Amino acid sequence: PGVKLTTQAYCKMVLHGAKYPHCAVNGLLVAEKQHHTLFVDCIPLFHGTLALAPMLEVALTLIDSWCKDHSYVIAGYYQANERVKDASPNQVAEKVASRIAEGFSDTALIMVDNTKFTMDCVAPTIHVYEHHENRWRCRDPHHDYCEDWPEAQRISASLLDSRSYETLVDFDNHLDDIRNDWTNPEINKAVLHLC
Amino acid sequence: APSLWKGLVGIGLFALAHAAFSAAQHRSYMRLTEKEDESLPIDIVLQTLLAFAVTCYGIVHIAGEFKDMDATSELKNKTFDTLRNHPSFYVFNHRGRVLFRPS
């Protein structure tokens, strides 16, 4: 089963990682339920301590309420480590992956690397882990998960060059300040306009 | 606003000094003339009181701090995100460093 994702979600993930480069970041990809797995968009969950179930329950239940409003389904959950020389999945990541795999039959664990994380990204710089309820832990050697690569580079370079990524909002900022949303409307407008 | 109060205080002080000089001149004249046990003019006395009341109004406005008594209100806006990071322990191992290294 191939894994395909739109440039919008990848830009969201990279941008959320850029927002907090000193702490670990967390995100949740969303697909469409109706063999290849297509990802629609991602939402950033939390940042910082990143070892708490209480707020995770709130966030995941809110996302579930969201997915039953516009007829969506939670695809998978992605996590980046704090240390640069760290590319191994933590226990919380596997627990969340199993929790999402109970419902959906296709949950990929996305790992953002840190060693190949610069302004001029080469290309893939994503680790796709394929986890289950059993002891199956395999990561794909190298495949193509993005649709158009040169256009993706142009938009990513424009987004990272121009300092317009301070507006990205997380679920924690929603609790701290109700006013900011969490769908990132301006980011969607920019991804549509740049194309 | 504070500058206006400071200027008003200075002007009042100058007026008070001028009233003092006028009273000094009046007493110097009085010492010239024998007897004549009279008081200083009431107009300059009223000017002195006007200068005294004006200078006591800005002297209170210049230093008004009146901080809140309760200790919870200043930390009512502060977020735990800023508290999480500390200035003692700072690990210099992040992806931004290698991302900003070329540029």
Q: Which residues contact A153 (CB under 8 A, 6 or more apart)?
A: A121, A123
Is residue A15 within 8 A of residue A43, CB to CB? The reply is no
* PDB resolution in Å: 3.3
Q: Give me the total of CB pairs closer than 8 Å, taking one residue from chain A and one from chain B.
A: 38
CB-based contact (8 Å) between A145 and chain B? no
User: Rounded to whole angstroms, how far apart are CA atoms A50 and A56?
Assistant: 9
User: Rounded to whole angstroms, how far apart are CA atoms A107 and A132?
Assistant: 8
Contact A84 B81 (CB under 8 A): no
Considering only CA atoms, which of A56, A55, A7, A9 is closest in space to residue A31?
A9
Contact B102 A172 (CB under 8 A): no
CB-based contact (8 Å) between A172 and chain B? yes
Q: Which residues contact A21 (CB under 8 A, 6 or more apart)?
A: B94, B95, B96, B99
- Show the DSSP H helices in chain B as ranges: 2-32, 42-61, 80-84, 95-100
User: Rounded to whole angstroms, how far apart are CA atoms A149 and A147?
Assistant: 6
DSSP string over A100-138: HHHH-S--EEEEE-STT-SSS--S--EEEEEE-SSS-EE
Which amino acid, residue B88? S
Is residue A44 within 8 A of residue A170, CB to CB? The reply is yes
Q: Count other Cβ atoms within 10 Å, centred on residue B21.
A: 11
User: Rounded to whole angstroms, how far apart are CA atoms B100 and B103?
Assistant: 5
Contact A119 B95 (CB under 8 A): no
Contact A118 B94 (CB under 8 A): no
Method used experimentally: cryo-EM
Measured CA distances, A102 to A32, A75, A99 (Å):
17, 12, 5
- Show the DSSP H helices in chain A as ranges: 7-19, 53-67, 91-103, 149-161, 171-176, 185-194
DSSP string over B41-58: PHHHHHHHHHHHHHHHHH
Give how far B81 is from chain A: nearest CA, Å. 8
Contact B95 A17 (CB under 8 A): yes
Write down how long chain B is.
103
Measured CA distances, B83 to B47, B75, B79, B86, B87 (Å):
57, 11, 7, 7, 10
Nearest CB to A117; choose among B81, B99, B102: B99
| Encoded tokens for A157 | 């370079």
Q: Which residues pair with A4 in a beta bridge?
A: A38
Contacts of B101 in chain A (CB under 8 A): 118
User: Rounded to whole angstroms, how far apart are CA atoms B64 and B84?
Assistant: 34
Contact A118 B98 (CB under 8 A): yes
A154 in helix, strand or coil? helix
Contacts of A120 in chain B (CB under 8 A): 102
SS3 for A53-66 is: HHHHHHHHHHHHHH
